[PDB]
Write a structure and sequence with these properties.
Helix content of chain A: 40-55%
Organism (chain A): Paramecium bursaria Chlorella virus 1
Protein name (chain A): Minor capsid protein P13
Strand content of chain A: under 5%
Keywords (chain A): Capsid protein, Late protein, Virion
Structural class of chain D: mainly beta
Oligomer: part of a larger assembly
Distance between the termini of chain D: 68 Å
Helix content of chain D: 10-25%
Number of strands of chain D: 24
Strand content of chain D: 25-35%
Largest sheet of chain D: 6 strands, antiparallel
Structural class of chain A: mainly alpha
Chains: A mainly alpha (66), B mainly beta (292), C little secondary structure (74), D mainly beta (436)
Largest sheet of chain A: none
Number of helices of chain D: 8
Number of helices of chain A: 1
Subunit structure (chain A): Interacts with the major capsid protein.
Shape of chain D: globular
Subcellular location (chain A): Virion
Distance between the termini of chain A: 51 Å
Radius of gyration of chain A: 21 Å
Radius of gyration of chain D: 25 Å
């Protein structure tokens, strides 16, 4: 059969799965990168900050991660 | 329905100085992304196929070993006195062989390095056997982990986890089914004496003395243990047995406790096992091992 | 000629650049939407068996493509 | 004595409630949630705002996700007390929603009235009336600021918020057609009110800001939003004046898994009128005294609960020539279906039939998928419009099969369906997964 | 500026709120469901429908599961405005639920009124009266179709629907006893209304059709349902005439995990009067003018909120001779308990004491298991009934522990207990898992 | 029949009926720890009366404490319509102390404000019944009133106070009773001769648990996520002519806050948040020649006609930057509570939420005022140019003006509702942050 709904469906699925994989790798690389960039915990005045140094030295709340 | 519904039970477990510390020296952690519902892992002609009938099935190097019975962990919970294999919290729904009756929580991987976080399934379901009844749901509170790290050199480090509270029993780290075509069955003893060929029985139980085991028609697979939990705070003579079961069906297991003890607990936390798997011709396999 | 758009270089604003996605985006939205259509099909409940629409006649062929979503029921 | 006399008296009938306890009601656990902040930002309206004009707005990417949108009006009332009936809602005539240039939903003033009539309950629809109408016997000249919340799939719960951060190549736009006639503001019936002022309008949008770990997750990963959309085409009624109860077979043009159908019979010249007018208090202008006229409503009391003034005797839904259920009388769809499926009170003249257990909820609970139904027909039976509307002795004294002679003015037939679809967002663009 | 100024205002006090998130509010995931369809089908009624008649219906297995059930009545009123008070459920006198020849539950007219007066609480109750009464000033001769829903354990939620295909070796019946006297339809007080028409009745059952695999599972596997039951026997009040506050020690004979105890003080000569009548607005027929008579209620305004007309002064419930709690005034049970346990407006003369934290819910939340309590007593203290009901200065101008002389007409006491039980279904037959 | 709907299966259903997870017609309930609830009377320390301050100590009759209901017996000095929430007017405030530390404190105006925002139609009418006369009762009538406390641990059992785990710290409530209660002992500001003193009692709801959890509760530490109310008062400038006042009010708050709510009131008349006017329900005698716009028709004081309110617009500003662009006053009275609660807020009471659903207890967004320099609430007032006695102007004027009697609403009450943590360990309790 011609099956328009399956030829477009299968093609869309290939792109969807290839693309979700790319997006998942992307956020994985950014979470990996920031753990390395800012590998420390904050202090009493930067209580949830990522902080670039072993002491405060470079804190922000615009790049928070778990 | 009682057969298709998942559940969990809450208990209060507050015990103090009667809890020998079984030191969970090995753990598993991940830094990779999630995936959809299949894994296709390969490198250096080493393939692992997870067909999503259950999270791992086939493997080999242009060969296969079996259609079922892929690597799995399985916890045999506390028994009345080791009478029947009833309370088997098995990672794989091997009995169905098709309907993946296991809840999967995370499908993590990167190329060459899959992970896995899954729940168990009780192999017997809601029936009764012999004279002993069993659990109510089909899935218990125990969870499992796998991490398979393929190293470029043909070494594939395989880690598993079992997480079960207040346990007392027999935990299966890996069940593997090699092909029937494995006439050579050898192990290296920790005394570095020699490789021993043990083909007279087909009922070989290797204890600590067995350092690494290998089997092959001519192309070989090796299994080298890396780590397993033990009571490492006091090092008492606790019922902790690490051994193989080497019969046509191959199983790597560890016992945590006797069926009945005086009065002991266990933390019941996360426990992992580290096994080094590697492949190639018998020559390359033995050559790598003998580096030790 | 496309030199005028940005300059990704050694440094970035704090990982706020998410402007890598446009050509993939065009390809999927084109194929995406699925056209289910039931212009001529069973008026009954039971999944009356499907005879594959092979082109066996030289002339008046149907373009109906029968429904593959009907459960047996009875 | 006290509580321990109840706990000691423990038994077999307690085991299935209290054995191996799973929860305790007196020490709960709250979930830790993603860091976000919310604000309302006013959007720029494109076009000349006025009566009968059509304008549009485009939502600026001032944030990461969008949820509630409120359209604001400032009106000056042209009549006096009771001359208006949801004038902000009548004015907000047609709201069209598109993602990336593809229209995915379209709401009408009559739909807003139907939705409120069916789904809001207690002091919330009262509060709604406060936001859309004059509810304090205000006099001519009163200036009032009105709020009409929009009710799209992303307006009712944050869980369906629009991921604009993931739509950097496609725009989100709302098109607004404003009514040319608003009762009590511009016209009294068909008579224009001299000096009536043009409206002032603005649209306020609730912007969600996420922290960095999550907003990048939203920006990079694709999404599948399972969303609601409205299906509607208008038609006309077949209401008999006498000697007969008319039947009418109306072809339905719906085609996606549908949560429920709803419909009404309205007089297009009187926004929100779904029942006949009668010389009964609240049922027409001047009702109860010699000045009563049953051709003009006492507008602010247009909504009633007296189904005697309705035109629907019975209705049935038939699918592919086979009945979906046995014919029910009109009072079933006005009173029982909303009792069973929503839990509120539906005023007379507004009817629904559900396919879902909880059509008021967001999670699917049963659908009728018209994508594989070849003939969907709504069959109506009308009441005979033989009661002299000016004689309460007859109107309040008759039976279910007969209605007011003024009922024949309900000439427009509006049948709605609310359905599911999937809105996919990926790599900065989006669109619907299914169309028909 | 904007939300960003709040988004990064992070401190130590946030670590337990937004630190380590688990739940995201702007990305909901919906769970997929086993397919079904809902259909309403008429049952055959065996016997003659009429005033005072008893009929039964067997529920035909037109489907897989049973959810709601609605009884239709067609009534013509013999009185005018305000002469009726929920007549559709006055007529629905008793409904007995029998599964496999085993009585499972039985509801009475008065209970339907107490449930509506106690658990049903919003627009739902107004819509309910719309289904059961004349709410628009209708006049003598008006005829309406009424809907009286049943509120059995499987009626209020789909989750407890009857697994008929798991019950193939016996049927389910409903026994309907219809009242001989219905206020405003065939009697006005005790006086017959000449020419009153007989009621017409039909019973609609809502059937669920399941998919192919789900029917197999339901028919083949055993099932347990957690269900509710109503326990009821009647008694007389001990209301005093003058100089004294009567005591009454009422022995209770209940026997299962009980969610709550509720009761009311009823005038047996007319359905729903739970308070004393008085010459204050709406508290008796003709109230406020010369014709006011305090022996006959203003039927449509029978329910009131004036505690002064509520005969109960205080009450205490004992278990095995020990107080379960210290004596409370009647107002505790009428307002405070339902505020905490239900959240609605309980009218005067209706009282609740709960064991459950939220008895309105389906999830068990605390019970009194009377199966292990050999005796319990409801101790009532009455108000002194010395206030002349015909003098509004005395009715509206007095103390809390004294009520109207007309309170002495509240001679019937109805004490209800609602409990849990378990319905077991095995190999095609079902029944209660616990006796008594 | 309905089977005709099941055959209508298609592609769109792979998202609905495929690989199903939920069976809707077989529900699963959870088994729960066996418990029983009873309420026990507490003893009030001190003389109960008008203007008196008394306190109580919660006896350890149980394992956990949930709700607490204060009851009063009042004798009214006026006729129907002369009272307006008199039980709450008398309950001037309640202070919550656990182990020597202040955990919360609520005020009579907070009770009215909370009602005005967070209670719905049926429970509000009920609430009104518990605290006021609603059937036109006349002079000399008596009624027993019930005022449930709003404290965090009161309306959700999940935060019940664990006395079983607080064997060393006492829990106490301090009650301040108003000296002037309109319609009971004062008629406006004039004393009512013969007015009786109130009688009061406090009932506390005790939870008893089964043995197995009582042990767990006694032995393990606990961290309860609890709510607090923050409040200070201010005064306003409400002009009659030539200008619209604009005040920049410092919001002196310091915890993760779910929402800010505020009102404008005339301190003489409890709960009056709008101007008086010669229109129905807007003043005593309204509609006839005896109408006066200095005294309300008290029982109808609460209205929904925002024309009688003084707020033209409001804006929250954090560290000199707007939190949102200026919104008109009716936004905070009708739209924010629509979005955030889903009920009706009467005229004169305003809410702005930070939380998505502050009516619940599951955290859903907070503003942490502990990590800012300065927050203010800018209030733009209407010009009070309308003659309150002329309905033609009161019911028919423009948005930016209100009635001249509006100038009496000189008290500004701004409330904040925040989260905190109540820690329990070794029989001792207390706040983690303060």
């Amino acid at each position: 059969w011609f099956s328009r709904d399956l030829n477009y469906g299968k093609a869309n699925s290939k792109i969807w799965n290839a693309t979700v994989a790319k997006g998942l790798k992307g956020i994985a690389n950014e979470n990996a990168e920031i753990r390395k960039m800012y590998p420390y915990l904050g202090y009493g005045d930067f209580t949830g900050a990522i902080c670039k140094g072993p002491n405060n030295q470079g804190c922000t709340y615009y790049a928070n991660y778990t | 329905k009682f057969f298709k519904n998942g559940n969990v039970m809450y208990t209060c477990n507050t015990f103090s100085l009667n809890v020998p510390v079984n030191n969970s020296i090995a753990t598993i952690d991940f830094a990779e992304h999630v995936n959809g519902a299949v894994f296709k892992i390969e490198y250096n002609r080493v393939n692992f196929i997870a067909p999503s009938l259950y999270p791992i099935s086939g493997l080999g190097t242009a060969v296969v070993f079996d259609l079922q019975k892929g690597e799995k962990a399985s916890q045999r919970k506390i028994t009345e006195f080791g009478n029947k294999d009833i309370r088997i919290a098995d990672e794989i729904s091997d009995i169905a062989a098709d309907d993946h009756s296991v809840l999967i929580t995370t499908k993590l991987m990167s190329e060459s390095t899959p992970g896995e976080l899954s729940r168990d399934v009780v192999l017997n379901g809601e029936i009764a056997t012999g004279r002993i009844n069993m659990n109510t749901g089909f899935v218990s509170d125990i969870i499992h982990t796998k991490k398979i790290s393929i190293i470029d050199d043909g070494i594939v480090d395989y880690y598993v986890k079992i997480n079960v509270p207040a346990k007392y029993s027999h935990g299966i780290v890996e069940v593997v089914s090699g092909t029937f075509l494995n006439d050579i069955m050898i192990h290296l003893v920790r005394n570095k004496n020699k490789w021993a060929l043990m083909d007279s029985k087909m009922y070989i139980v290797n204890n600590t003395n067995g350092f690494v085991i290998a089997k092959n028609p001519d192309t070989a697979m090796g299994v080298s243990l890396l780590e397993w939990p033990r009571g490492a705070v006091v090092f008492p003579p606790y019922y902790n047995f690490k051994k193989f079961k080497n019969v046509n069906k191959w199983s790597i297991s560890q016992q945590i406790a006797s069926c009945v003890n005086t009065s002991v607990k266990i933390p019941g936390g996360e426990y992992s096992w580290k096994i080094r798997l590697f492949f190639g011709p018998i020559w390359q396999v033995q050559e790598s091992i003998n580096s030790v | 000629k496309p030199s005028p758009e940005a300059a990704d270089f050694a440094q970035f604003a704090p990982k706020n650049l998410q402007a890598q996605n446009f050509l993939t985006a065009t390809q999927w939205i084109g194929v995406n939407t699925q056209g289910s259509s039931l212009k001529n099909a069973n008026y009954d409940l039971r999944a009356d068996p499907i005879i594959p629409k092979a082109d066996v006649g030289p002339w008046m062929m149907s373009s109906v493509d029968p429904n593959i979503y009907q459960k047996p029921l009875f | 004595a006290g509580g321990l006399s109840q706990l000691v008296a423990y038994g077999a009938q307690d085991v299935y409630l209290t054995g191996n306890p799973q929860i305790t009601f007196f020490k709960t656990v709250y979930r830790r949630y993603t860091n976000f902040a919310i604000e309302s930002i006013q959007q720029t309206i494109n076009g000349s705002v006025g009566f009968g004009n059509k304008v549009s707005t485009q939502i600026s990417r001032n944030g990461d996700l969008i949820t509630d949108i409120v359209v604001e009006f400032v009106l000056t009332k042209g009549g006096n007390g009771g001359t208006t009936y949801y004038p902000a809602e009548e004015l907000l005539q047609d709201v069209e929603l598109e993602i990336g240039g593809q229209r995915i939903d379209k709401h009408y003033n009559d739909w807003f009235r139907t939705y409120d009539a069916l789904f809001r309950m207690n002091d919330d629809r009262y509060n709604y009336r406060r936001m859309t109408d004059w509810v304090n016997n205000e006099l001519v000249g009163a200036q009032k600021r009105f709020y009409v919340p929009l009710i799209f799939f992303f307006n009712q719960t944050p869980g369906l918020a629009l991921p604009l951060i993931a739509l950097q190549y496609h725009e989100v736009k709302l098109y607004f057609t404003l009514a040319s006639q608003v009762q009590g503001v511009n016209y009294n019936g068909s008579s224009a009110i001299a000096g009536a002022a043009q409206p002032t309008m603005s649209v306020w949008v609730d912007y969600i800001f996420l922290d960095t770990q999550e907003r990048t997750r939203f920006a990079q990963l694709p999404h599948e939003y399972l969303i609601e959309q409205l299906q509607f085409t208008g038609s006309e009624t077949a209401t008999p004046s006498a000697t007969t109860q008319a039947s009418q077979n109306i072809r339905l043009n719906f085609n996606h898994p549908t949560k429920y159908l709803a419909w009404n019979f309205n007089n297009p010249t009187n926004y929100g009128q779904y029942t006949a007018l009668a010389n009964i208090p609240g049922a027409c202008s001047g009702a109860g005294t010699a000045a009563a006229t049953v051709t003009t409503p006492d507008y602010g009391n247009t909504g009633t609960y007296n189904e005697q003034l309705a035109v629907l005797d019975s209705a049935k839904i038939q699918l592919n020539g086979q009945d979906r259920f046995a014919t029910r009388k009109g009072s079933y769809f006005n009173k029982v279906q909303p009792y069973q499926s929503i839990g509120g009170v539906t005023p007379a003249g507004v009817y629904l039939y559900s396919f879902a257990l909880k059509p008021a909820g967001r999670q699917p609970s049963g659908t009728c998928n018209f994508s594989r139904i070849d003939n969907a027909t709504l069959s109506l039976t009308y009441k005979t419009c033989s009661i002299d509307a000016t004689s309460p002795a007859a109107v309040l004294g008759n039976t279910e099969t007969v209605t007011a002679n003024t009922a024949t003015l309900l000439t427009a037939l509006n049948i709605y369906a609310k359905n599911y679809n999937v809105l996919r967002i990926m790599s900065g663009m989006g669109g619907l997964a299914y169309a028909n």
